[PDB]
């Protein structure tokens, strides 16, 4: 998936890791959001099932259950660049983010300024 960064998916590998994808494994590609409410998005996988979650260590995981940890605030940038605060890490402003090679797992680095956080899961050609 397109980001203003090295475009990959927020893939929960079956081998317990939230990594991006130079070599898209086609299935374990965790990235599909189910909005609970207003600007609150649970990042589900429809093939691995697992939910893009965030921990206090400063890294993304594919949690089986949806928590605040998995609930991501639609910050958006307006222009289809869907930035998302992990609800629990509101006090750290930790957004979802794409690691520039073949990875995803962050927290502290990923704020409003890293191209990493600017996702496109919207009606646009560059999606």
From Swiss-Prot:
GO terms for cellular component: cell cortex; cytoplasm; cytosol; extracellular matrix; extracellular region; extracellular space; nucleoplasm; nucleus. Plays an important role in the regulation of cell survival, cell division, angiogenesis, cell differentiation and cell migration. Functions as a potent mitogen in vitro. Acts as a ligand for FGFR1 and integrins. Binds to FGFR1 in the presence of heparin leading to FGFR1 dimerization and activation via sequential autophosphorylation on tyrosine residues which act as docking sites for interacting proteins, leading to the activation of several signaling cascades. Binds to integrin ITGAV:ITGB3. Changing residue 81 to A: No effect on integrin- and heparin-binding, loss of FGFR1-binding, defective in inducing FGF1 signaling, cell proliferation and cell migration. One of its GO terms (biological process) is positive regulation of cell migration. Changing residue 105 to R: No effect on LRRC59-binding. One of its GO terms (molecular function) is S100 protein binding. The keyword Amino-acid biosynthesis does not apply. Residues 99-115 are annotated as: Heparin-binding. It comes from Homo sapiens. Keywords: Acetylation, Angiogenesis, Cytoplasm, Developmental protein, Differentiation, Growth factor, Heparin-binding, Mitogen, Nucleus, Phosphoprotein, Secreted. Monomer. Homodimer. Interacts with FGFR1, FGFR2, FGFR3 and FGFR4. Affinity between fibroblast growth factors (FGFs) and their receptors is increased by heparan sulfate glycosaminoglycans that function as coreceptors. Found in a complex with FGFBP1, FGF1 and FGF2. Interacts with FGFBP1. Part of a Cu(2+)-dependent multiprotein aggregate containing FGF1, S100A13 and SYT1. Interacts with SYT1. Interacts with S100A13. Interacts with LRRC59. Interacts with CSNKA, CSNKB and FIBP. While binding with LRRC59, CSNKA and FIBP seem mutually exclusive, CSNKB and FIBP may cooperatively interact with FGF1. This is Fibroblast growth factor 1. Heparin binds at residue 5. Transmembrane segments: none annotated. Belongs to the heparin-binding growth factors family. The chain holds residues 29 to 155 of 155 of the full protein. Its main location: secreted. In the nucleus, phosphorylated by PKC/PRKCD. Changing residue 82 to A: No effect on integrin-binding. No effect on integrin- and heparin-binding, loss of FGFR1-binding, defective in inducing FGF1 signaling, cell proliferation and cell migration. It is found in: Secreted; Cytoplasm; Cytoplasm, Cell cortex; Cytoplasm, Cytosol. Changing residue 106 to E: Reduced integrin-binding. Defective in integrin-, heparin- and FGFR1-binding, and defective in inducing FGF1 signaling, cell proliferation and cell migration. It comes from the Eukaryota. Predominantly expressed in kidney and brain. Detected at much lower levels in heart and skeletal muscle. Changing residue 105 to E: Loss of CSNK2A-, CSNK2B- and LRRC59-binding. Reduced integrin-binding. Defective in integrin-, heparin- and FGFR1-binding, and defective in inducing FGF1 signaling, cell proliferation and cell migration.
């Amino acid at each position: 998936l397109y980001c203003s960064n090295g475009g990959h998916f927020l893939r929960i590998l079956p081998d317990g890791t939230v990594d991006g994808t130079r070599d898209r494994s086609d299935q374990h590609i965790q990235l599909q959001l189910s909005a609970e409410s207003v600007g609150e998005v649970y990042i589900k996988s429809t093939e691995t099932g697992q939910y893009l979650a965030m921990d206090t260590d400063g890294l993304l995981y594919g949690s089986q259950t949806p928590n605040e940890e998995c609930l991501f605030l639609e910050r958006l940038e307006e222009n289809h660049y869907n930035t998302y605060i992990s609800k629990k890490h509101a006090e750290k402003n930790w957004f979802v983010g794409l690691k520039k090679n073949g990875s995803c797992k962050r927290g502290p680095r990923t704020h409003y300024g890293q191209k990493a956080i600017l996702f496109l899961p919207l009606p646009v050609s560059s999606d």
